[PDB]
RNA sequence: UGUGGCAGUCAAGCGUUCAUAGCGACAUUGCUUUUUGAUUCUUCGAUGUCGGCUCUUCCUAUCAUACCGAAGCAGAAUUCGGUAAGCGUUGGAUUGUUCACCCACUAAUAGGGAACGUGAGCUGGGUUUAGACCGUCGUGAGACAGGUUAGUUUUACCCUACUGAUGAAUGUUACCGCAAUAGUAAUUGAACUUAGUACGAGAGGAACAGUUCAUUCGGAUAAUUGGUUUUUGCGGCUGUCUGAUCAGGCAUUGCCGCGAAGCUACCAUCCGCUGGAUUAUGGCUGAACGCCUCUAAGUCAGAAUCCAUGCUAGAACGCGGUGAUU
């Protein structure tokens, strides 16, 4: 049992939850919910979406 | 000796097992006669480990290693990694490999001395292979076939390669690997030679479809 | 499942009914394949025989060499792009459909497989496990 | 003419008529076979379904491809308060089947079964069982006469139990009285067990145990009046059909000049009794046990009640059976769980499962955290107290 | 019933030897109404007429499945026969087609009926009016046993029937039950192991038990994944209008992104049992016929068969126990 991390929003992924998108150049994308998955399919930059972890690491929250 | 064996009926053992000088890895779903061909002419010489790799039973093509080291892909779990770290002796070094470029056994064509890799694997993994296996890594393809793992069975003595290979490539790879090479077939003419059979210094196990003239060339190039 | 296929494949989501044009991922020369049937399928009234990852389809070649066109061959679906469930928990899916030209015994027509390869199709079919690049 | 393409049916003619059930508590039609050597124990137990959750465990199945490997699975937590016996009732056997000859009630029944015997509890003078509980004013000679008449007669002995509904997050206050049969030998021992358990409670550490296969009996989640394409599974008709495309198109032939019982029509869907068999208990948890959702692998203290409770139900603070896979009847329903009728031996049964992880995230949305301490650790401090 | 279609009867011969392993001429006796003729009894104050889609149920002259028995059956596969219809018989190219013929798949792609089932179920592609064109025929209007193109398909609010739903009266009222009767459902394949073993000159190459998955069907649920989104929940956006910020109206849910709950999907998950009696057949003792013979008396085993165990309703004038009875 490994708790994976979201490739878009940095949230933690318990087993039997979310999706997993193997892309065409074989990079593996693990999504917590359909929110981060359907923001990834819109090619949204994760640093500009203000509720993620990569946002709050780039703008120094906390 | 050259022992002919099937895995549940499958004539390709190199997919389903990894034979090295100090260990032998097998899949979990084997018969009595499959494990017998290893436990007869090995017996109590090297540890024979029943394992899976990343939930699969293709562990000869997932992993790649030799006498000094063993490499596992990224999707290998913690129970499997702990079982491999326990059952194997402390001489061999096991390290997970972080690359998005293949599974390791089709890339790494290695022995104790000289390794060949798929040329798309990167420098950060090449340094890790040369560190863990302790093997000088080159970057060459057998006659355009980029997957050098499944198309080149390799040992410390000699090696069998892809059967449609030019003589110039045979002489080039014989100057590189410093072993003699003879192109041939296995498993009644199946050209996937590196996955059709396993080999080490004292043993070579192939499939039940490997005919006697093919087996003669195998034991001739491997000098057994 | 079937003859030449090694092992009992667990059921994944049927995502490729008859008519799907998948990419051909090996260097035999076909640019895309075309499902005409599915080996091991069932018979039920007005229901398309749907393939999946790991299945063995009968396929024709629409784009590619002239030697491969206008003839029916077998093939093996190696990516799905319809989300299926591995039993360890995750639902996953590739980007786009794929398959490789084969013979009825499971041997590969080509030499190397581009793209990632789903591990349900690497464990069932051994010869795909040899020519595969990225498994999973 | 024949069918021109011979094809299976739609639906199942043994589950007819598909009408509403009688009550919401589905009857138990058959209890397990009697064995007159075993110690006395119940054959079924009345719980309340709460909802589902996810379970990670180690499938240990030799020869299977997922041998020694982690699988996630769906279970249902069925809430289970302890259940108190209020009477016995014994059946003699006739050439017209069994027949209840006498029933014996307890001494002082609670206000959950006294509320079951009145439709309007608020106007009523609450005078149930006055002239019966005055039969214990003597030495009990009438009631010992009743138990002697059960001992001499009455091939099988069933026990009137009822749930404890005020220990439940429902708003009903009225308990479901029921009969549960006894498997223990020598019916004098049965009725003495029942006499010693008058007004005493019964927990599921005694009835059910870990890893056991249990059947589950309840009333289907109802769906009102329902047309035929979703009730039975008929094809939709094409777009061009005048007067609609959601029907059975041909009802019947000319002869027979009637509509057969076998064709598919519209009517009730759901709210039928059902029995689903072969469900394996993954956990039997207790109410006074803190950290019910704890696991030997997980070791974190947490109850099985999710973040913000089970949806539309509340908070498990009681016993609970935790059973593999789905179960007929939705949330908040009286589910009667039954011992298996037959000795099962399949290597899908007889598998001893210790869990590895219980999912306790919020089911009121796409939940992310397991415990609120983990939310307060990952999210950080907020605009509140710190 | 000629006519299709189907089944016996004898038997010359074919089949290495050899009428019967299987063929079956020459004759001959029948069955079927799934064909087409004949008739013209019913219907012309009109039983809406082909095909397809849809959906039931029935029959068997069985394609597959179960269990048997034979070969010019060693194994393997094939062919035939028997009890058998419990269960299943597909996806397509072309054609309006029924019929066909290919391409795959499959365990197998059997044959049929119910007013050539099914138009107040649909479609209306076909034939079959009126428009029009062409060919041949005709002096001509027009004809065709021909080809092609365009061509309103109406009504159920009755009665029965079915599917659900109440309901008076059997002292009132409530709870717990029993159970007649009616329905009943599971199906098929693959892999490992058995075992490269048996059998075989080799070539090749099984089965019984165990295990894991799958095909088709069925019943449920909705933790997860996906769909939906009038929670118009939050956000964004355009046009206009409230003087502007703010907060909003209107664009017949204004559009777009995400979206709980509910509902839902082999696009999700779980579950689908076991004993008894038999048919074909194989027998045991055992006569008939002082040997013989599974049969006559008796008796043992036996199938997807039947019946219970199980599962669904419950007699609204089938029944029981118990609380209270102003």
Curated annotation (Swiss-Prot), chain A:
<comment type="function">
    <text>Component of the ribosome, a large ribonucleoprotein complex responsible for the synthesis of proteins in the cell. The small ribosomal subunit (SSU) binds messenger RNAs (mRNAs) and translates the encoded message by selecting cognate aminoacyl-transfer RNA (tRNA) molecules. The large subunit (LSU) contains the ribosomal catalytic site termed the peptidyl transferase center (PTC), which catalyzes the formation of peptide bonds, thereby polymerizing the amino acids delivered by tRNAs into a polypeptide chain.</text>
</comment>
<comment type="similarity">
    <text>Belongs to the eukaryotic ribosomal protein eL24 family.</text>
</comment>
<comment type="subunit">
    <text>Component of the large ribosomal subunit (LSU). Mature yeast ribosomes consist of a small (40S) and a large (60S) subunit. The 40S small subunit contains 1 molecule of ribosomal RNA (18S rRNA) and 33 different proteins (encoded by 57 genes). The large 60S subunit contains 3 rRNA molecules (25S, 5.8S and 5S rRNA) and 46 different proteins (encoded by 81 genes).</text>
</comment>
<protein>
    <recommendedName>
        <fullName>Large ribosomal subunit protein eL24A</fullName>
    </recommendedName>
</protein>
<feature type="modified residue" description="Phosphoserine">
    <location>
        <position position="7"/>
    </location>
</feature>
From Swiss-Prot, chain B:
<keyword id="KW-0597">Phosphoprotein</keyword>
<dbReference type="GO" id="GO:1902626">
    <property type="term" value="P:assembly of large subunit precursor of preribosome"/>
</dbReference>
<dbReference type="GO" id="GO:0005730">
    <property type="term" value="C:nucleolus"/>
</dbReference>
<dbReference type="GO" id="GO:0042273">
    <property type="term" value="P:ribosomal large subunit biogenesis"/>
</dbReference>
<dbReference type="GO" id="GO:0043023">
    <property type="term" value="F:ribosomal large subunit binding"/>
</dbReference>
<keyword id="KW-0963">Cytoplasm</keyword>
<dbReference type="GO" id="GO:0005634">
    <property type="term" value="C:nucleus"/>
</dbReference>
<dbReference type="GO" id="GO:0006364">
    <property type="term" value="P:rRNA processing"/>
</dbReference>
<dbReference type="GO" id="GO:0000470">
    <property type="term" value="P:maturation of LSU-rRNA"/>
</dbReference>
<keyword id="KW-0539">Nucleus</keyword>
<comment type="subunit">
    <text>Monomer. Associates with the 60S ribosomal subunit.</text>
</comment>
<dbReference type="GO" id="GO:0042256">
    <property type="term" value="P:cytosolic ribosome assembly"/>
</dbReference>
Curated annotation (Swiss-Prot), chain C:
<dbReference type="InterPro" id="IPR019972">
    <property type="entry name" value="Ribosomal_uL14_CS"/>
</dbReference>
<dbReference type="GO" id="GO:0022625">
    <property type="term" value="C:cytosolic large ribosomal subunit"/>
</dbReference>
<comment type="similarity">
    <text>Belongs to the universal ribosomal protein uL14 family.</text>
</comment>
<keyword id="KW-0007">Acetylation</keyword>
<protein>
    <recommendedName>
        <fullName>Large ribosomal subunit protein uL14A</fullName>
    </recommendedName>
</protein>
<dbReference type="Pfam" id="PF00238">
    <property type="entry name" value="Ribosomal_L14"/>
</dbReference>
<keyword id="KW-0488">Methylation</keyword>
<keyword id="KW-0687">Ribonucleoprotein</keyword>
<feature type="modified residue" description="N6,N6-dimethyllysine; by RKM1">
    <location>
        <position position="105"/>
    </location>
</feature>
<dbReference type="GO" id="GO:0002181">
    <property type="term" value="P:cytoplasmic translation"/>
</dbReference>
<keyword id="KW-0689">Ribosomal protein</keyword>
<comment type="function">
    <text>Component of the ribosome, a large ribonucleoprotein complex responsible for the synthesis of proteins in the cell. The small ribosomal subunit (SSU) binds messenger RNAs (mRNAs) and translates the encoded message by selecting cognate aminoacyl-transfer RNA (tRNA) molecules. The large subunit (LSU) contains the ribosomal catalytic site termed the peptidyl transferase center (PTC), which catalyzes the formation of peptide bonds, thereby polymerizing the amino acids delivered by tRNAs into a polypeptide chain.</text>
</comment>
From Swiss-Prot, chain D:
<dbReference type="GO" id="GO:0005829">
    <property type="term" value="C:cytosol"/>
</dbReference>
<dbReference type="GO" id="GO:0002181">
    <property type="term" value="P:cytoplasmic translation"/>
</dbReference>
<dbReference type="GO" id="GO:0003723">
    <property type="term" value="F:RNA binding"/>
</dbReference>
<dbReference type="GO" id="GO:0006412">
    <property type="term" value="P:translation"/>
</dbReference>
<feature type="cross-link" description="Glycyl lysine isopeptide (Lys-Gly) (interchain with G-Cter in ubiquitin)">
    <location>
        <position position="135"/>
    </location>
</feature>
<dbReference type="InterPro" id="IPR044892">
    <property type="entry name" value="Ribosomal_L3_dom_3_arc_sf"/>
</dbReference>
<dbReference type="InterPro" id="IPR045077">
    <property type="entry name" value="L3_arc_euk"/>
</dbReference>
<keyword id="KW-1017">Isopeptide bond</keyword>
<keyword id="KW-0488">Methylation</keyword>
<dbReference type="GO" id="GO:0006364">
    <property type="term" value="P:rRNA processing"/>
</dbReference>
<dbReference type="InterPro" id="IPR009000">
    <property type="entry name" value="Transl_B-barrel_sf"/>
</dbReference>
<dbReference type="GO" id="GO:1990145">
    <property type="term" value="P:maintenance of translational fidelity"/>
</dbReference>
